[PDB]
Design a protein around this ligand. Structure first.
Ligand SMILES: CCCCCCCCCCCCCCCCCC(=O)OC[C@H](COP(=O)([O-])OCC(O)COP(=O)([O-])OC[C@@H](COC(=O)CCCCCCCCCCCCCCCCC)OC(=O)CCCCCCCCCCCCCCCCC)OC(=O)CCCCCCCCCCCCCCCCC
Ligand SMILES: CCCCCCCCCCC(CCCCCCCCCC)(CO[C@H]1O[C@@H](CO)[C@H](O[C@@H]2O[C@@H](CO)[C@H](O)[C@@H](O)[C@@H]2O)[C@@H](O)[C@@H]1O)CO[C@H]1O[C@@H](CO)[C@H](O[C@@H]2O[C@@H](CO)[C@H](O)[C@@H](O)[C@@H]2O)[C@@H](O)[C@H]1O
Ligand SMILES: CCCCCCCCCCCCCCCCCC(=O)OC[C@H](COP(=O)(O)OCCN)OC(=O)CCCCCCCCCCCCCCCCC
Ligand SMILES: CCCCCCCCCCCCCCCCCC(=O)OC[C@H](COP(=O)(O)OCCN)OC(=O)CCCCCCCCCCCCCCCCC
Ligand SMILES: CCCCCCCCCCCCCCCCCC(=O)OC[C@H](COP(=O)(O)OCCN)OC(=O)CCCCCCCCCCCCCCCCC
Ligand SMILES: CCCCCCCCCCCCCCCCCC(=O)OC[C@H](COP(=O)(O)OCCN)OC(=O)CCCCCCCCCCCCCCCCC
Ligand SMILES: CCCCCCCCCCCCCCCCCC(=O)OC[C@H](COP(=O)(O)OCCN)OC(=O)CCCCCCCCCCCCCCCCC
Ligand SMILES: CCCCCCCCCCCCCCCCCC(=O)OC[C@H](COP(=O)(O)OCCN)OC(=O)CCCCCCCCCCCCCCCCC
Ligand SMILES: CCCCCCCCCCCCCCCCCC(=O)OC[C@H](COP(=O)(O)OCCN)OC(=O)CCCCCCCCCCCCCCCCC
Lengths: 59, 174, 124, 64, 90, 486, 179
């Protein structure tokens, strides 16, 4: 009745250890442009500066 | 639920206000001034406290009490040093001896008692019986011996056989 | 200042009076000090490194010089163990053989096995 | 449990009122309703932080 | 009531559960005290051999004396951390 | 609701005893005395058949910050005992009413401050021995140091400024490297824990260079050779309680921490590196027990005596053998008895009577204090390591365990019986003998409380000295839990 | 493996660098001062700084390259010997012997502590937790630094610790077996 109450605590600490390893791997995971920056306007693509614009500028 | 008195507790301070300080009231190296003090010093001993009276009161009574006891304490112990005062009998019980002889010392004896009888369950006293049981399991024919004979017929098995089974926990080794 | 350790503490003291260290034992006892037990007047300046010059300090003999004393002690140590070593060459021989024992030297009695007979056993 | 998490923050509040009395050289019980004020305020802080931690745990539960 | 808990090795018990690890520790320990009581029993027999034999103890229990000096390096406490932290044949 | 109601009642009882009575010497005695009645009943329900930790509790968990917690995810602060952890709690709790008593008729100025500080730095060293994380061991390994700083600075004798700075500085300076070595194994293992770290091995190149950060951290706390700068000059200006609780409790903590922290996860980094521990322990025994001879002050001698016995003790721990571990534990439990009794003799009784601690005034103590010269002699002859006192059982087993591991270092280190006799008997026969001194009016005999302390600290050595087995029922797992001889 | 150092080349480069440092420090000392000063007192009331910046810069790298060549490896000890030489240069300004010995011991110990960690004020990008394999191993892999396993191989611990004290190539009980 005491070896079991230790197995409970050691499971409760190994769970916290795996919780840390996860949440330390979830930081270094690379992130989308829609989560990291502006959620709508999800493209990085400009079309910047359209008043005297020339056809053939897109690529 | 002990008792006190309030009006006595006020009149005591009225009595003390006319008295000299503790650094003067006894430095006169008799009974004109030293006879009122020898009763007031016994007002320290007379034990008006109250068990439940400390709980059920306000701090106005408490500060008044505490100042009065703090002056009666000096009038007792200064008069004990220079010179009830004028007696000599032993031994006047102190302040610490109630909870060092009746709580510290019996718990500290009970600690010795529990340490002596908790030493009965030891690994040597259990390992001897487990080794004898391991002998009697494999070779139960020495149970058929008489009671005096078995203590020498176990030892010939102990000396004879290994009976330790430690190399069987080490199956990775061989 | 007499001993080599008292000399080696001259640059430490700056305001200490630096008195002459003299043994408390080699003072005479017949002068009536404050402390007859330790031979010391009431306000007398203690020395740099006092507790080698206390009454409770070592015994400090005064008859021989310590260097001479070293020579005489090692002289007795030499004259004993030299004479007792030279006198082993002038020894006479014994008239008897060492005695003998039965049973192939009592090899079996002081332990032993037939293969192990060399280590145990004396004078067959 | 929510209840001990309220009582402990309320005890922090009683400690704030006590120590603020003792810097001002007042007695221990000076304005004894001020203990009720500080207890309710810091207990409300315990409410807030308790609920934020609840919702954060539930957000972690929904990621599986 | 003389209780006898079970023996658990360290081999193949998956050191992520603290139940079997701690039982393996205690079992290797308790068997080691049993391994020691044989030394403490032959010593008790060797002294009786000596005290009854008197002068012929050299040849009566040469075997018990050599027995005791054989058990003495190899029956003592030695540690579960030596066998738990290391595996032979790897 | 119930355990909250107990606290709300007990704080009210404390308040009203503050109100009516002036001092809380009586309620601190009552509380610290009830701690015995609690911890002995914990000793009754202690299962000795299990290596296991019996009484476990987490404080400051996520789901319940103010109190206990039963969850499947644990990031609080663990606490528990077995065996080893429990002998030192029992050493502690029967000593803290004696330091709380020890300054009874003494203080006279802000007594409520002083006894609060003494009781607090006793409770913190209870929970030192309850702790189970590397951080929860460490967050109370220096919760002592603030209150120790202020207990030395105020209430210190004279030149207590410098001593208070030393007890902060040296302990902190050696303690930050312990913090480094705790940080490294908390970012490698991601576990602060005293249960699981038998399982975790490390690379020998990693295990090598985190053993340094703990070893030169316990080199400061049990003061080994490039340290013990600070030990005598924190003693010699301490008050009475903060010298007893220093030398009986703060020193044995690193004896406990070399067992608890170092030996079971540094298993392979020690056997390369024990013969540096033997160098340092030997030349604390040879050097610091030889500088005792030339000491003008009387408390400084018992300070260096503490150094010499704690230098014997850590060559029993670091033996990797089975007798030395138990020998060092019985040293730690018996030195913690015999040594605060000596501090009651030096700065306890004799400084209360004559207020100057130079040795040169003090001779002829027998003719007017016979029943103090007895306590001089039997307590000195208990410190030397006469048998039947519990110091010799520890000195004997630790010199034997250090003789197994390396016999030349044990043969040289055996001279400590001589070297511990020299200064102690030189002090004893200066104090005991001679004509009663010139400088010294005759003062009182040793009083009822300063006998009541002493006979407790003498019987508690003699019981261990007649039977050292009265605590083998606790320790027989921890004799095995730390051996790596495969 | 390694490559030996040009002691003369590295020493004369450091001599030029120490020269430039002495010049810019004397130029700094002129302007950050008081009282009557001109163009010529750059090296008159210089405080002797150009000798400091020159001698330290020669002695450190000459002793460093010489120690790394005669030991035929690169570790933190070469920084210890080089910092001892630097302390010898900085200790000679105060013309006293125990000062000088203290400078040589303590500056050498501080430079050895700098050299043992990696001889870098910054970090190494690789070979640290964020950029190195850490945690448990997955299979019977060679346990690198930063990693944990559950049971080391015995043939590895006998190579590392030795064959003496209590550690043996076979555990003691199965070494004493009935057959
Ligand atoms: C453990 C702690 C370790 C560290 C501190 C230990 C204390 C050492 C003693 C210091 C001392 O007493 O100096 C007094 C001295 C002042 O002289 P003073 O007070 O007039 O002298 C009277 C004394 O009584 C002195 O007179 P005296 O006769 O009593 O003693 C003579 C002599 C004797 O010297 C000693 O006292 C120490 C002797 C040790 C011998 C040990 C033998 C056993 C081993 O005294 C000295 O001159 C000591 C100078 C040592 C300087 C060490 C500088 C190390 C800097 C470390 C920074 C990190 O201080 C200085 O010389 C100025 C120091 C200013 C800082 C200089 C910083 C230079 C940094 C260069 C780079 C270093 C490496 C950096 C990293 C590298 C990679 C980038
Ligand atoms: C608590 C107070 C004690 C103070 C200790 C501080 C000193 C600690 C230094 C040791 C340490 C940091 C580890 C620290 C971790 C905990 C630190 C704890 C607190 C820090 C305060 C720095 O190691 C440095 O040591 C120096 C000298 O020893 C070297 O000097 C320089 O040498 C010249 C170029 O090499 C320069 O040209 C010269 O200019 C310098 O002279 C450096 O090269 C080296 O980087 C070791 O790190 C490294 O160890 C190596 C294995 O060796 C590991 O690679 C391994 O490769 C295989 C080999 O089996 C295996 O595959 C595997 O095993 C592993 O993959 C690495 O992964 C790496 O991690
Ligand atoms: C090869 C075979 C070996 C066999 C032995 C060989 C001979 C060895 C002889 C030396 C050993 C003797 C024991 C050492 C202790 C000496 C104690 C002592 O003598 O104290 C006496 C002294 C007072 O006595 P005293 O004044 O003469 O009495 C006169 C009465 N009318 O009282 C005192 O005040 C003295 C206080 C100082 C005590 C001496 C301190 C130095 C002790 C030296 C021990 C060396 C330890 C070095 C350890 C190094 C280990 C690497
Ligand atoms: C400085 C920062 C450090 C952290 C803050 C300081 C700690 C604050 C005090 C909290 C720690 C001790 C008190 C509460 C824990 C123990 C009492 C308790 O309620 O738990 C019972 C305890 C363990 O719990 P458990 O066995 O699992 O049973 C509970 C079932 N629901 O069962 C037991 O086995 C009892 C163990 C009790 C022994 C505890 C150590 C004794 C020393 C007590 C010091 C307390 C100091 C309080 C100061 C009061 C000032 C107002
Ligand atoms: C010097 C200055 C720095 C010193 C720092 C010291 C910090 C010490 C802080 C201690 C606070 C935490 C105490 C741990 C709680 C101890 C406890 O268990 O009390 C009982 C109750 C918890 O009850 P529960 O968890 O529900 O389980 C009961 C099952 N029998 O717990 C409670 O109800 C809460 C009671 C404690 C309230 C504390 C309020 C702040 C005190 C100021
Ligand atoms: C368990 C014991 C701990 C809590 C007990 C508190 C209840 C008793 C408080 C008390 O009586 O002493 C407080 C002290 C005295 O004031 P008071 O008694 O009211 O009047 C003087 C009568 N002579 O009031 C004071 O004067 C306190 C003044 C403090 C002066 C600086 C001392 C600081 C000591 C605290 C350490 C600081 C940092 C702690 C860091 C964490 C370390 C644990
Ligand atoms: C182990 C067995 C248990 C430990 C010993 C138990 C002893 C218990 C009782 C001790 C009583 C000793 C005593 O009272 O001696 C008093 C003696 C007084 O000398 P006196 O002739 O009266 O004249 C003095 C001038 N004013 O005072 C003196 O002069 C000093 C001499 C002390 C003699 C004490 C004898 C016991 C010493 C045993 C050493 C044990 C070390 C451990
Ligand atoms: C090819 C070219 C070869 C030469 C290239 C090397 C250039 C290095 C230049 C270094 C010049 C030294 C800086 C300097 O001039 O210091 C003087 C100035 C004031 O010093 P001063 O007034 O003379 O003396 C007062 C002392 N109480 O002191 C100052 O306040 C200036 C501020 C310090 C200069 C900043 C340097 C940053 C790095 C500091 C080193 C820290 C290292 C940490 C390890
Ligand atoms: C007071 C507390 C504060 C600490 C004060 C310390 C001051 C600094 C002392 C000097 C330390 C600098 C020593 C330079 C060591 C240079 C070195 O490279 O050490 C090599 C060695 C490991 O080198 P490795 O690559 O693994 O190959 C050989 C393995 N036998 O590793 C070693 O030789 C061990 C080096 C550490 C020795 C401990 C020194 C005391 C710390």
């Amino acid at each position: 009745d005491i070896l079991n109450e230790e197995a409970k605590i050691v499971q409760a600490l190994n769970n916290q250890r795996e919780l840390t390893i996860k949440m330390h791997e979830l930081k270094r995971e690379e992130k989308d442009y829609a989560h990291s920056y502006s959620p709508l306007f999800s493209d990085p693509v400009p079309q910047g500066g359209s008043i005297g614009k020339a056809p053939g500028s897109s690529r | 639920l002990r008792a006190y008195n309030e009006e006595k507790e006020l009149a005591l301070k009225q009595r003390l206000s006319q008295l000299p300080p503790p650094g003067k009231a006894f430095v006169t190296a008799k009974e004109a001034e030293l006879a009122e003090l020898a009763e007031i010093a016994a007002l320290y001993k007379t034990d008006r406290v109250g068990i439940l009276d400390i709980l059920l009161l306000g701090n106005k009574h408490a500060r008044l009490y505490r100042d009065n006891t703090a002056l009666l304490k000096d009038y007792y112990y200064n008069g004990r040093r220079i010179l009830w005062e004028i007696k000599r009998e032993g031994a006047e019980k102190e302040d610490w001896v109630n909870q060092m002889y009746f709580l510290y010392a019996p718990s500290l004896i009970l600690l010795l008692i529990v340490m002596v009888y908790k030493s009965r369950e030891d690994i040597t006293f259990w390992a001897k019986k487990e080794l004898d049981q391991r002998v009697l399991d494999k070779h139960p024919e020495i149970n058929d011996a008489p009671e005096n004979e078995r203590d020498a017929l176990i030892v010939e098995r102990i000396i004879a056989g290994d009976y330790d089974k430690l190399a069987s926990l080490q199956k990775k080794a061989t | 200042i007499r001993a080599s350790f008292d000399k080696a503490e001259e640059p430490m003291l700056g305001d200490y009076p630096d008195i002459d260290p003299f043994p408390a034992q080699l003072k005479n006892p017949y002068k009536k000090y404050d402390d007859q037990q330790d031979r010391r007047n009431l306000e007398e300046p203690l020395s740099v490194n006092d507790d080698l010059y206390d009454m409770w300090s070592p015994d400090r003999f005064t008859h021989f010089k310590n260097q001479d004393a070293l020579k005489y002690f090692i002289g007795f140590l030499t004259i004993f163990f030299g004479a007792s070593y030279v006198a082993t060459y002038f020894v006479p021989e014994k008239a008897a053989i060492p005695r003998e024992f039965p049973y192939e030297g009592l090899w079996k009695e002081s332990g032993g096995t037939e293969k192990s007979k060399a280590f145990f056993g004396q004078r067959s | 449990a929510l209840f001990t998490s309220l009582v402990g923050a309320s005890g922090l509040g009683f400690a704030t009122k006590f120590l603020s009395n003792k810097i001002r050289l007042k007695p221990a019980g000076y304005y004894p309703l001020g203990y009720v004020f500080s207890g309710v305020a810091w207990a409300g802080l315990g409410l807030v932080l308790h609920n934020v931690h609840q919702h954060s745990l539930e957000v972690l539960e929904k990621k599986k | 009531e003389h209780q006898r808990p079970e023996l658990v090795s360290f081999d193949d018990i998956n050191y992520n559960d603290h139940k079997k690890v701690r039982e393996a520790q205690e079992s290797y320990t308790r068997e080691q005290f049993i391994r020691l009581e044989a030394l403490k029993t032959v010593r008790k027999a060797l002294e009786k051999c000596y005290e009854e034999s008197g002068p012929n103890h050299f040849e009566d229990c040469k075997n018990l004396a050599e027995q005791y000096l054989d058990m003495l390096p190899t029956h003592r406490l030695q540690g579960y951390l030596g066998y738990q932290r290391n595996d032979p044949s790897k | 609701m119930f355990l909250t109601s107990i606290l709300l009642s007990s704080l009210y009882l404390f308040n009203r005893i503050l109100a009516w009575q002036g001092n809380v010497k009586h309620f601190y005695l009552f509380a610290s005395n009830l701690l015995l009645l609690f911890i002995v009943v914990l000793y009754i329900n202690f299962n000795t058949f299990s290596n296991s930790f019996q009484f476990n509790f987490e404080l400051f968990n996520s789901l319940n910050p103010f109190g206990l917690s039963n969850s499947d995810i644990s990031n609080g602060l663990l606490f528990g005992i077995d065996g080893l952890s429990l002998t030192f709690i029992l050493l502690t709790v029967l000593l803290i009413p004696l330091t709380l008593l020890g300054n009874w008729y003494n203080i006279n100025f802000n007594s409520n401050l002083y006894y609060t500080l003494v009781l607090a730095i006793g409770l913190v060293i209870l929970l030192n021995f309850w702790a189970l994380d590397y951080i929860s061991f460490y967050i109370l390994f220096e919760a002592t140091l603030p209150l120790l700083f202020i207990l030395i600075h105020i209430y210190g004798s004279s030149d207590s400024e410098r001593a208070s700075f030393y007890v902060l500085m040296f302990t902190l300076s050696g303690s930050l490297f312990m913090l480094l070595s705790i940080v490294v194994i908390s970012i490698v293992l991601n576990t602060t824990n005293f249960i699981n770290h038998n399982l975790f091995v490390l690379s020998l190149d990693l295990q090598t260079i985190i053993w340094l950060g703990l070893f030169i951290a316990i080199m400061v706390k049990t003061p080994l050779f490039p340290i013990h700068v600070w030990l005598p000059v924190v003693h010699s200006e301490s008050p009475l309680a903060g010298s007893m609780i220093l030398a009986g409790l703060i020193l044995k903590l690193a004896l406990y921490a070399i067992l608890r922290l170092l030996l079971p996860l540094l298993c392979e980094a020690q056997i390369l590196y024990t013969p540096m521990i033997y160098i340092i322990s030997l030349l604390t025994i040879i050097l610091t027990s030889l500088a005792t001879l030339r000491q003008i002050d009387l408390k400084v001698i018992i300070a260096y005596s503490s150094i010499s016995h704690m230098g014997i003790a850590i060559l029993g721990v670091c033996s990797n053998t089975s007798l030395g571990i138990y020998g060092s534990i019985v040293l730690g439990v018996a030195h913690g008895f015999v040594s605060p009794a000596l501090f009651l003799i030096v700065g306890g009784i004799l400084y209360d009577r004559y207020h100057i601690r130079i040795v040169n005034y003090y001779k002829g103590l027998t003719t007017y204090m016979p029943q103090l010269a007895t306590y001089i002699i039997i307590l000195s002859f208990a410190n030397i390591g006469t048998p039947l006192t519990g110091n010799f059982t520890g000195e004997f087993l630790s010199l034997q365990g250090g003789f197994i591991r390396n016999p030349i270092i044990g043969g040289i280190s055996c001279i400590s019986v001589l070297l511990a006799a020299i200064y102690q008997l030189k002090l004893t026969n200066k104090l005991t003998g001679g004509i009663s001194s010139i400088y010294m009016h005759r003062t009182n005999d040793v009083t009822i409380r300063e006998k009541f302390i002493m006979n407790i600290l003498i019987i508690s050595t003699l019981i261990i000295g007649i039977c050292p087995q009265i605590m083998y029922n606790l320790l027989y797992w921890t004799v095995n839990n730390y051996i790596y001889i495969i | 493996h390694f490559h030996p150092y040009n002691t003369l080349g590295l020493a004369t480069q450091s001599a030029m660098v120490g020269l430039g440092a002495g010049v810019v420090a004397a130029a700094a000392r002129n302007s950050l001062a008081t009282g009557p000063r001109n163009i010529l007192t750059t090296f008159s009331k210089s405080g002797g700084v150009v000798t400091i910046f020159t001698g330290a810069s020669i002695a450190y790298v000459f002793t460093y390259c010489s120690a790394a060549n005669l030991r035929e490896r690169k570790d933190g000890w070469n920084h210890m010997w080089a910092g001892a030489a630097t302390g010898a240069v900085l200790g000679a300004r105060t013309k006293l012997v125990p000062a000088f010995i203290g400078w040589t011991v303590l500056c050498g110990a501080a430079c050895g502590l700098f050299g043992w960690t990696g001889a870098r004020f910054n970090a190494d990008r690789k070979a640290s937790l964020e950029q190195s394999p850490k945690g448990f191993v997955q299979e019977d892999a060679h346990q690198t630094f930063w990693e944990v396993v559950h049971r080391r191989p015995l043939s590895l611990t006998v190579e590392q610790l030795g064959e003496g004290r209590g550690i043996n190539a076979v555990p003691i009980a199965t070494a004493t077996e009935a057959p």
